[PDB]
Structure 1
Amino acid sequence: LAGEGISVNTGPKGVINDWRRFKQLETEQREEQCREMERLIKKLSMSGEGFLDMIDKEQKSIVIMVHIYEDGTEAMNGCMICLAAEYPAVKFCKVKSSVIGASSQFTRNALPALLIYKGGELIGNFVRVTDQLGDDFFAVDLEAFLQEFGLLPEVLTSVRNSASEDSDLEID
């Protein structure tokens, strides 16, 4: 048992394919782990790729919130639909916890999750909103509660109007 100076040398450069494949897979799991860790412990104490690349994409100047649910979820979903009908500029969406594979404590004691993302960072991590909001409050109550913290953003055509750059020229 000697030769502590192994100096693997040519090994890493000769098997770099498998090492880089494993590194890529581990990093792919790493973005998911970093995204999910922002919710657990950080706020709990006090397909997944679709969610990941939806959070990564879109403009940082648009507030995007997501909801974590398991099968009063129905009332909050109806209120969220009403807010979506009232705030077309926002992109309300929901995703199951089992798809994300969050912790068991979040599944068992944090079923109602109001996660708000603004430019890749958590400006709001409302979790287990049963106590401070209720069970059967309407959409206007949720809108007022969210607007009190300054998070939510502040005619009707017939059906549609939108359709070279030569607009119109009468010049001879």
Structure 2
Amino acid sequence: EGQATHTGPKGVINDWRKFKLESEDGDSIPPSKKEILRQMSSPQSRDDKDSKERMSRKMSIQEYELIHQDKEDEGCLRKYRRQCMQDMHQKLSFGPRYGFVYELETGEQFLETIEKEQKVTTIVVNIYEDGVRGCDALNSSLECLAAEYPMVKFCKIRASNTGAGDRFSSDVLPTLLVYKGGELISNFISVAEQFAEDFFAADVESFLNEYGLLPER
């Protein structure tokens, strides 16, 4: 990644640029650069230390130049706007791999799953124990959710099987931990508290969506 190009002013500049890389009426095709000079005109790619700094002028004269000699086609603008959102969803949309809640039996297994997983995958782990109120309803919800969000890996484990006994008393159970990219993104102690006694998969979902833990909209 290095230098920013998606957010803030840098994002606007990069967005305007990519826009032309499609506006001109062909992109990587023969209607754009043939000198294979660039896939686009860019500024601040090689440090010009003539002034004693890693030269950083994001917008060049030729860039600002077009800005005035530009024909911002309203139609070409709306098209571009749709294309950006479509592209982003696509990259955030990874195949529907799973579809089932998997049972982890030992602490080693837990650590192994978050460790060896693709860094882009969200992992919802459910720590519970039978008989404890809320657990069964949560597990039922999860099975329905795992089947709807196949790109999210759902898992469950008895507090007893964690390898941290007393640390997980029925008072904090069920606990729902969420990981992604190797790190813990959320920790919901007594998750059942967030819902009404009788809760179902759509409630659990509304809840996870509100913390932004679920993909695809």
Listed one character per residue, the Cα deviations across residues 100-145 of structure 1 (whole Å, up to 9, x for unaligned) are 1324252231111111001111111011023222321111111111
Runs of 4+ in 1 over 3 A off after TM superposition: none
Following the alignment from structure 1 to structure 2, what is the Cα–Cα distance between the partners of residues 51 and 73? 18
After TM superposition, the score normalised by the length of structure 1 is: 0.59
Following the alignment from structure 1 to structure 2, what is the Cα–Cα distance between the partners of residues 138 and 53? 29
The residue type paired with residue 134 of structure 1 is A
Q: Percent identity?
A: 58
**2:201 corresponds to which of 136, 139, 142:** 139
The residue type paired with residue 213 of structure 2 is L
Which aligned pairs between 1:44-123 and structure 2 lie closer than 5 A?
47-71=106-130, 72-123=134-185
The answer to whether the Cα contact below 8 Å between 2:122 and 2:180 also exists between their aligned partners in 1 is yes
Secondary structure of the corresponding residue to residue 169 of structure 2: helix
2:70 equivalent in structure 1: none
After TM superposition, the score normalised by the length of structure 2 is: 0.47
The answer to whether residue 180 in structure 2 is matched with residue 152 in structure 1 is no
**Greater mean alpha carbon deviation, residues 87-96 or residues 99-108:** 99-108
Following the alignment from structure 1 to structure 2, what is the Cα–Cα distance between the partners of residues 78 and 138? 7
- Which runs of 5 or more residues in structure 1 are unaligned? 1-46, 155-172
> Looking at both structures, which has the greater relative contact order when contacts are Cα pairs under 8 Å and sequence separation is at least 6?
1
- Which runs of 5 or more residues in structure 2 are unaligned? 1-105
Secondary structure of the corresponding residue to residue 151 of structure 1: coil
Q: Number of paired residues?
A: 108
